[PDB]
Nucleic acid binder design. Structure first.
Lengths: 66, 178, 113, 722
DNA sequence: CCACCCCCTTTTATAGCCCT
DNA sequence: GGGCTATAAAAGGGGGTGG
C-alpha cells in the first residue's frame, strides 16, 4: 500500500515533508528487496534467517533486535 | 420542481490582519496541531460544531467542515475569540463563503455514456479512472459530479442560490440521458 | 504496515507462526532504515521536501545495487501512468452553446411530463 | 505473573476504551494477589501515566491507588509561595523553529515527582493524576514507607501561576494540567495545618492575566467547603462578573451559584441582565448567568422578572446551543404569563431535540384564547410551505427556508404540530371561522373535541378548487393512483398528497370506521396515528363512539403484517381486555401472530393475570416473541422456571432464560453439567451454560416465592463449596 | 530576480473494487 | 473500516523554468 508508507514516514517529526513520487517509488523497492532477501534464506534451509544475516555483508545491518 | 439538494460542506475565508505567532498558538492550545516542514499553518478543531480551521501567519484563516452557512460564520467568530484569548489583537475584517459542497439523490439511474457524448467538450468521463464524469457548468460557475447510481454532488458555488439554480438546469438534462 | 500483505508474499513446507510475526517486524524495520538515510540525503542537498532522486541516492549508499536498477525502471513506468491519467469558442460563445443545451432539454422534459 | 503480562499488553495494544476499562478493572480487583510483582506493575504503570493518550493516564493512576494499600506516605509539607518567570506549555518548543530506567520500587516515586514540572504537558497531567490517587487511599496505609517531596506545594503553586496551556476543544475552555494540579491541592488541604493557601488563591482573582484568574477560580471550585471567609470571597466574585474573558464570567457565576447571596443581591442582577442585553452573537457566559438568576428568584420569592427586561429573554428560545434552551424553560416553569406562553408553543413546533421540547409540552398540559387561535393558523397551513417570519416571534434558518423543510421532511413537521395539538385539547377552546389543504384535517378534530365537551364525503373535485396542494398536482395521475390504489407513480407529488388526502377524508368522516381502515395503512407519520387514536379512546370512555367493525379489522391488521394499527393498541390497551372482543380472541388462531407484536402493552399492567391463557398457549406453540413479554412479570417467570426445571428444553432455554430474571439462573447450573457430561445436546447445553456462568454472581431477588427462593439459597450454597 | 505554475494539506459528499 | 481515483475553494511555503 502507498498510504501505509506515507503515514509511517510523516509520523516522525524529524522527517517532516515527503513527496508523492518518493513514497510511491520506495513502496515497491522496499517490498521487492525484502521478498528477495527472505527468499534466499528459505533456499538455505527460524535459525536459517539468522544464518543469512551473517552470510551476507549487506544483510548484516538487520537482525539487530529480537 | 422535484426534490431539493442538501449541502454537507462549507469553506470560508476570514482576514485578521495581524502577525500571528504559529509556535505560541500551537504550544498553548491542546486542540491545535502544527508541523512546519509538513505545512505552514496551525490546524485547530472544534467539537460543537465539528469544524477545522487552517490558521496561517499574518492573520489569514480558512474555516472548513461546517454543514450550514450560519454555522460557518458562527465557527469563524468562535476561532477569532480563541486567538484573542491568547493575547493577539484579533479583528473580524471580512468573511467570504468560498465553497459550498452539496449532495442530491435522484431515484432514476443515469447512462453516463450518453451525457458525455452530448457534452463532449463539457464532460471528461473515464470508466475505471474514476466512477463518474466531471460536468463543468460555465455560468453559474459550478463543477458537478454525476454518478451511475443516481447520487450527484455540486461543488464550486460561492452563493447558496447558485446550487438551486444549477440543479433546475441539470435536472432536465439528466432526464433525457436515462 | 499490514501484516497480511507481507504474509501473502512470503507464503507464495509451512512457515512458522513465530517467524511470521518476526518477518513483519523486520519488514517494518527496513522501511524506517531507508527513510532515515533519505532524511539525511534531503538535508545534504539543503532541500526541505524529500525528493525521489534523493531517495534513489540513499539506496546506493546503503549497499543495494540490484534494488537501485528496479527503482529507476518502476519510476519511469509510474511517470507514464501519471501522465496518461480545443473547442475554439470563447467563454461567452461556449456559454450560448451550453445554455441552448439546458433550454432544449427543458422542452423535451415538458413534452414528457 | 503470566496474567500481569496479559494485562499491560492489552492496556497498550487495544484500540477500544471499553476493553481497556475492563482490563484495568480486572487488575485493580485482584491487585491483592499480584502484590509480589509490585516493581513490575509500577514499571509498566509508569508508561500508562506518561502516555500521550488522555485515557491511559487515568487508567494508570487507577492501578496506583490500588497499590496504595501497601505503602505509607509522609506528613512533611513545605508551604512556600515563590514567583518565577518560567512558563509551562505543551512542549520544549524545540520541535518547531531524561527518564530513568524504573526497576527499583523507589525509582517510580522519584521520577513521578520530577514529572510534575516536565516540559511536556501530558507528562505533567499524568504525574498530577498519579499524586491525586496516592492521597485518595492515604487512610488505608501499610508498613513500607515512601517519602513524598515536601516541595509538592511550591510545585502546585508554580503550575497554577506559570502554566499557560489551555484546551479550546469545546465552547467551555479548560486547562488540563492546571485542573489536575488544582484538584491535587484540594486533596492535600486537610493534611496541611494552619495555612494562607485559601486566602492566597483569592489574590489570583485580581491578577491582570485571565489564565491566573482561571487557576484561581478552578482551585476555589474544589476547596469551596474549606473557605471560612465567605463574605470576603463573594465580594470579589460579584466584581469578577462582566469580565472581558467569557470563561471568567462562566466560572464566577457557577461558583457564586453555590454561595448564598442575601446582602448584595440587586448588584448581581445589574450585571446579569446586562450580559443578556449586550446582544453578542456567540456567548458561553449566558447559560451560567441564567442559572444564577434562577437562584435569586427561588430563594427570595418576593421578586419578579421586570417587564422591560423580559424583552431580553425572548431570543433565548431560538438559541442554537441546547444548554441555554434547557435553563430558560427551567426558569419560567413556576411563573405563568401570556407573553412567554406564545414562545413556549414555538419550541414545540420548531426545536429539533425532543428532550428540551418535552420540558415545554408539560408546561402547556399544566390557557388564554388568543394563543389557541394564533397557533391554529400555523398548523392549518401547508406542510410543503415553510413557516412565516412575521407570524413567529423567534426566527431560525431551519423550518423557515424552502430547503430547510426538505431536511426535516413531511413526517417531522406534522409530528411537531400534533404534539402541540394534544396540549390544546386539555383546556377550553373557542371555535373560529378562519380556514385555509391540511387545515380541514385539524379543524375537523378541533370541532370534534369541542363536540366531546359529522359531515359526509363531498365531491372529489371540490377539494381541488379550495385547497392549494391538490391544485398544483395533476388530477389525471392522482385518479390513477387512487384507482390502483397502492402502486407508486413517477410524479413526485402523487404519493405524498395521497397520504394528505387519506388523512383529510378519514378525519372529516370522524367518528368513522370505513375511511379509518385505509388511514392506518398508508400514513407515513406515526405521531398523527397516536393523535387519531387519542380521540377514539376518549369517545369510548364517554361512550360516544361505537367501534366493533373497525376493532375486528384492527386485530387482523397486526396479524397480517400491517404495523400501522399498533399505534391504536398502544393508546387503547387495558380497555381491550374489559371489552367484549377479548372473549372472541380466545377462539381465533391469529392470537399468536397478534400478541407477537402487541404483548409489551398488556404486560405492563397487573391485568396480565386475566391474559394468563396466552402464556399457556405461548408455552405450547413455543414462540419466544410472546414468552419474552411475560418474563417481564415475576409471577409468569416463576411459572416458567417450574416448567423448565421439570422438563428441560435446551434449544428454547437459551432464548427465554436470559430474557427473564438472572435470579433463577443458579437453578440450571447442576442440570446443564449433567447434560454435557452425558453428551445430551452437548453443543447447545454448553452454549446455554456459557450464558449462565457470567451471570452467576447476580444478587438474588427477595420478591421470589419461598417455593423457588429456598431452592436458589440451597443451590447457591452448594456451588459456594469450592 | 521575481513571475508563473506545480506541489502540499484541510474538509466534504459521492462509489464500486479490493483488502484487513 | 479504510485506501484507490476525482471535484471545488481559500492559503503559503518550497521548488523548477521563463522574460
Amino acid at each position: 500500500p502507498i498510504s501505509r508508507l506515507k503515514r509511517i514516514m510523516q509520523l516522525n517529526e524529524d522527517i517532516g515533508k515527503i513527496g508523492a513520487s518518493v513514497p510511491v517509488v520506495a513502496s515497491k523497492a522496499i517490498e521487492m528487496f525484502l521478498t528477495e532477501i527472505v527468499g534466499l534464506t528459505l533456499k538455505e534451509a527460524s535459525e536459517f534467517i539468522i544464518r543469512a544475516t551473517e552470510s551476507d555483508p549487506k544483510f548484516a545491518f538487520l537482525k539487530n533486535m529480537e | 420542481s422535484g426534490i431539493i439538494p442538501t449541502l454537507q460542506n462549507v469553506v470560508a475565508t476570514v482576514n485578521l490582519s495581524c502577525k500571528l505567532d504559529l509556535k505560541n498558538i500551537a504550544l498553548r492550545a491542546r486542540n491545535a496541531e502544527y508541523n512546519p516542514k509538513r505545512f505552514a499553518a496551525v490546524i485547530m478543531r472544534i467539537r460543537e460544531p465539528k469544524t477545522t480551521a487552517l490558521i496561517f501567519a499574518s492573520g489569514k484563516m480558512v474555516i472548513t467542515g461546517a454543514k450550514s452557512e450560519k454555522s460557518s460564520r458562527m465557527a469563524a467568530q468562535r476561532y477569532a475569540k480563541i486567538i484573542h484569548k491568547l493575547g493577539f489583537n484579533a479583528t473580524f475584517d471580512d468573511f467570504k463563503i468560498q465553497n459550498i459542497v452539496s449532495s442530491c439523490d435522484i431515484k432514476f439511474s443515469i447512462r453516463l455514456e450518453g451525457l458525455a457524448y452530448a457534452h463532449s467538450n463539457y464532460c471528461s468521463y473515464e470508466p475505471e479512472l474514476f466512477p463518474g464524469l466531471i460536468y463543468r457548468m460555465v455560468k453559474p460557475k459550478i463543477v458537478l459530479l454525476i454518478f451511475v447510481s443516481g447520487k450527484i454532488v455540486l461543488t464550486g458555488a460561492k452563493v447558496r442560490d447558485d446550487i438551486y439554480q444549477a440543479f433546475n438546469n441539470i435536472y432536465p438534462v439528466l432526464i433525457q440521458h436515462r | 504496515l499490514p501484516k497480511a500483505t507481507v504474509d501473502k508474499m512470503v507464503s507464495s513446507s509451512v512457515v512458522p507462526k513465530e517467524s511470521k510475526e518476526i518477518f513483519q517486524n523486520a519488514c517494518i524495520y527496513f522501511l524506517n532504515m531507508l527513510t532515515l538515510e533519505a532524511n539525511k540525503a534531503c538535508e545534504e542537498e539543503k532541500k526541505k521536501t524529500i525528493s525521489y532522486e534523493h531517495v534513489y541516492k540513499a539506496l546506493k549508499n546503503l549497499g543495494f545495487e540490484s534494488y537501485v536498477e528496479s527503482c529507476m525502471k518502476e519510476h519511469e513506468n509510474y511517470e507514464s501512468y501519471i501522465k496518461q491519467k480545443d473547442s475554439g469558442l470563447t467563454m461567452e460563445e461556449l456559454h450560448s452553446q451550453q445554455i441552448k443545451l439546458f433550454q432544449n432539454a427543458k422542452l423535451q422534459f415538458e413534452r414528457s411530463f | 505473573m503470566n496474567r500481569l503480562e496479559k494485562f499491560f499488553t492489552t492496556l497498550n495494544t487495544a484500540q477500544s476504551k471499553v476493553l481497556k476499562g475492563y482490563t484495568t478493572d480486572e487488575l485493580v480487583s485482584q491487585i491483592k494477589e499480584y502484590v509480589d510483582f509490585t516493581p513490575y506493575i509500577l514499571k509498566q504503570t509508569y508508561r500508562l501515566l506518561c502516555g500521550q493518550a488522555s485515557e491511559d493516564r487515568r487508567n494508570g493512576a487507577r492501578i496506583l491507588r490500588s497499590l496504595m494499600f501497601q505503602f505509607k506516605l509522609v506528613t512533611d509539607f513545605k508551604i512556600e509561595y515563590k514567583e518565577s518567570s518560567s512558563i509551562y506549555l505543551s512542549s520544549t518548543g524545540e520541535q518547531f523553529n531524561d527518564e530513568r530506567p524504573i526497576e527499583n520500587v523507589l525509582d517510580f516515586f522519584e521520577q513521578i515527582s520530577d514529572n510534575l514540572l516536565s516540559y511536556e504537558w501530558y507528562k505533567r497531567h499524568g504525574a498530577f493524576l498519579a499524586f491525586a490517587a496516592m492521597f485518595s487511599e492515604i487512610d488505608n496505609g501499610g508498613d513500607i514507607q515512601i517519602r513524598v517531596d515536601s516541595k509538592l506545594f511550591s510545585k502546585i503553586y508554580e503550575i497554577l501561576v506559570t502554566d499557560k496551556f489551555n484546551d479550546f476543544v469545546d465552547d467551555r475552555t479548560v486547562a488540563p494540567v492546571r485542573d489536575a494540579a488544582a484538584y491535587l491541592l484540594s486533596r492535600i488541604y486537610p493534611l496541611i495545618g494552619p495555612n494562607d493557601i485559601i486566602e492566597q488563591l483569592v489574590g489570583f482573582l485580581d491578577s491582570g492575566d485571565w489564565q491566573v484568574q482561571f487557576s484561581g477560580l478552578i482551585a476555589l471550585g474544589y476547596l469551596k467547603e474549606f473557605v471560612e471567609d465567605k463574605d470576603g470571597l463573594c465580594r470579589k466574585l460579584v466584581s469578577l462578573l462582566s469580565s472581558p474573558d467569557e470563561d471568567i464570567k462562566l466560572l464566577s457565576a457557577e461558583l457564586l451559584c453555590h454561595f448564598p447571596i442575601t446582602d448584595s443581591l440587586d448588584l448581581v442582577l445589574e450585571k446579569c441582565w446586562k450580559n443578556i442585553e449586550s446582544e453578542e452573537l456567540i456567548s458561553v457566559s449566558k447559560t451560567s448567568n441564567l442559572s444564577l438568576l434562577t437562584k435569586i428568584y427561588r430563594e427570595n420569592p418576593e421578586l419578579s422578572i421586570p417587564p422591560e427586561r423580559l424583552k431580553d429573554i425572548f431570543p433565548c428560545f431560538t438559541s442554537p446551543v441546547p444548554e441555554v434552551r434547557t435553563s430558560i424553560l427551567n426558569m419560567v416553569k413556576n411563573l405563568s404569563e401570556e407573553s412567554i406562553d406564545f414562545l413556549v408553543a414555538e419550541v414545540v413546533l420548531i426545536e429539533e431535540k425532543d428532550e428540551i421540547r418535552e420540558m415545554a409540552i408539560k408546561l402547556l398540559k399544566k390557557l388564554p384564547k388568543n394563543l389557541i387561535l394564533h397557533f391554529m393558523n400555523v398548523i392549518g397551513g401547508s406542510l410543503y410551505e415553510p413557516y412565516s417570519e412575521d407570524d413567529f416571534v423567534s426566527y431560525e434558518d431551519l423550518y423557515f427556508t424552502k430547503s430547510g423543510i426538505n431536511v426535516v421532511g413531511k413526517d417531522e413537521i406534522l409530528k411537531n404540530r400534533c404534539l402541540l395539538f394534544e396540549c390544546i385539547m386539555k383546556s377550553g377552546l373557542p371555535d373560529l371561522q378562519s380556514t385555509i389543504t391540511t387545515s380541514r384535517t385539524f379543524i375537523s378534530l378541533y370541532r370534534s373535541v369541542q363536540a366531546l365537551v359529522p359531515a359526509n364525503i363531498e365531491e372529489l373535485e371540490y377539494y381541488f378548487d379550495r385547497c392549494k396542494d391538490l391544485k398544483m398536482a395533476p388530477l389525471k395521475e392522482f385518479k390513477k393512483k387512487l384507482s390502483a390504489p397502492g402502486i407508486r407513480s413517477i410524479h413526485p407529488m402523487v404519493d405524498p398528497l395521497y397520504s394528505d388526502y387519506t388523512r383529510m377524508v378519514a378525519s372529516i368522516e370522524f367518528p368513522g370506521l370505513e375511511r379509518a381502515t385505509a388511514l392506518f395503512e398508508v400514513e407515513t407519520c406515526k405521531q398523527f396515528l397516536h393523535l387519531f387514536s387519542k380521540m377514539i379512546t376518549e369517545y369510548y370512555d364517554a361512550e360516544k363512539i361505537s367501534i366493533d367493525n373497525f376493532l375486528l379489522k384492527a386485530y387482523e391488521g397486526l396479524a397480517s403484517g400491517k404495523d400501522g394499527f399498533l399505534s391504536f393498541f398502544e393508546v387503547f390497551n387495558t380497555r381491550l381486555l374489559a371489552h367484549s372482543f377479548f372473549h372472541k380472541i380466545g377462539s381465533l388462531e391469529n392470537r399468536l401472530d397478534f400478541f407477537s407484536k402487541t404483548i409489551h402493552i398488556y404486560t405492563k399492567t397487573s391485568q396480565i393475570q386475566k391474559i394468563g391463557f396466552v402464556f399457556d398457549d405461548a408455552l405450547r406453540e413455543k414462540n419466544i416473541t410472546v414468552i419474552n413479554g411475560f418474563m417481564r412479570s415475576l409471577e409468569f417467570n416463576e411459572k416458567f422456571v417450574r416448567k423448565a426445571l421439570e422438563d428441560l428444553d435446551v434449544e428454547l432455554l437459551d432464548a427465554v432464560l436470559m430474557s427473564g430474571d438472572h435470579s433463577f439462573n443458579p437453578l440450571f447450573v447442576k442440570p446443564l453439567l449433567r447434560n454435557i457430561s452425558g453428551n445430551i445436546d452437548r453443543e447447545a447445553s454448553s452454549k446455554v451454560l456459557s450464558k449462565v456462568i457470567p451471570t452467576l454472581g447476580f444478587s438474588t431477588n427477595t420478591k421470589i416465592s419461598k417455593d423457588l427462593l429456598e431452592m436458589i439459597e440451597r443451590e447457591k450454597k452448594s456451588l459456594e463449596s469450592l
